[PDB]
Design a protein around this ligand. Structure first.
Ligand SMILES: C#CCOC(=O)NCCCC[C@@H](N)C(=O)OP(=O)(O)OC[C@H]1O[C@@H](n2cnc3c(N)ncnc32)[C@H](O)[C@@H]1O
Ligand SMILES: [Mg+2]
Length: 263
């Protein structure tokens, strides 16, 4: 008897990218399932015996090291932010991203992006720190949203403001970063300040990057050249570990380092 679609779905939960097992050599479902359960249990046992690190935590630590070592100040800013910051980001009450915001009270929301707090840090730090100002943050962001989007995700955003804010410098930082992580990519932009660049892995967007200045800056009291980019950590993990589904890379009770916890 052929496997049912439901049975196949169940085995796929238990399958890890490089399992050499074949789902069509006569073995009944129960046997295939039992084999995969054994393997996934042994995977968790191995993590628990040796490293004990969560991939999302560990990636955050590796990225933090990378940016700190290259002169960028580590920021930890609020996750719960004023709703006014979203409007000030140019996201109107009729925009599609406006419908994706998780509101919390009359006045607050879960940040859907790192830009507003980083804008405020850039303005504030310009009074204390020498040119150029280099900062980054990694942490949770939220958007009401498939196989590439999560409602709860983790962004890296880095910024430089003042001298050296060129397209070439931005591309070089992106290039050093992803070659450090071991992640294949191409940078796409219309090749003729103002530019947005997409960092792609095949069809998957890893990042949107901006060469400022842009008109939005004045809303935030910023009037200097700047460059920056945001990367989703769950996307980076998905690519690095070859997960078929991004939910395997997320904060989750169903997956641990891309291993099913329903065993
Ligand atoms: C001060 C200052 C200025 O600083 C800056 O603003 N500097 C320039 C950075 C601007 C770009 C960026 N920061 C941005 O605005 O969000 P995005 O919608 O473009 O998506 C960014 C990335 O987040 C991930 N991502 C987004 N949505 C999701 C999701 N639902 N699930 C998983 N991953 C996601 C994914 O990797 C995507 O490519
Ligand atoms: Mg984008």
């Amino acid at each position: 008897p052929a496997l049912t679609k439901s049975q196949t779905d169940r085995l796929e939960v238990l399958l890890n990218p490089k399992d050499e097992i074949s789902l069509n050599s006569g073995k009944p479902f129960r046997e295939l399932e039992s084999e995969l359960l054994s393997r996934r249990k042994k995977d968790l046992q191995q993590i628990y015996a040796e490293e004990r690190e969560n991939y999302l935590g560990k990636l955050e630590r590796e990225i933090t090291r990378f940016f700190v070592d290259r002169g960028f100040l580590e920021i930890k800013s609020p996750i719960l932010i004023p709703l006014e910051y979203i409007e000030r980001m140019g996201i109107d009450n009729d925009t599609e991203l406006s419908k994706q915001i998780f509101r919390v009270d009359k006045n607050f929301c879960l940040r859907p992006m790192l830009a507003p707090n980083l804008y405020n840090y850039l303005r504030k730090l310009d009074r204390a720190l020498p040119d150029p100002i280099k900062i980054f943050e990694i942490g949770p962001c939220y958007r009401k949203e498939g196989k590439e989007h999560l409602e709860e995700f983790t962004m890296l955003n880095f910024c430089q403001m003042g001298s050296g804010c060129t397209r070439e410098n931005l591309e070089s930082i992106i290039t050093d970063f992803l070659n450090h992580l071991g992640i294949d990519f191409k940078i796409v932009g219309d090749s003729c300040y103002g530019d947005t660049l997409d960092v792609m892995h095949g069809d998957l967007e890893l990042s949107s990057a901006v060469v400022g200045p842009i008109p939005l800056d004045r809303e935030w009291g910023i009037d200097k050249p700047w460059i920056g980019a945001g990367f989703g950590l769950e996307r980076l993990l998905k690519v690095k570990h070859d997960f078929k589904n991004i939910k395997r890379a997320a904060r989750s009770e169903s997956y641990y380092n891309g291993i099913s916890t329903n065993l």
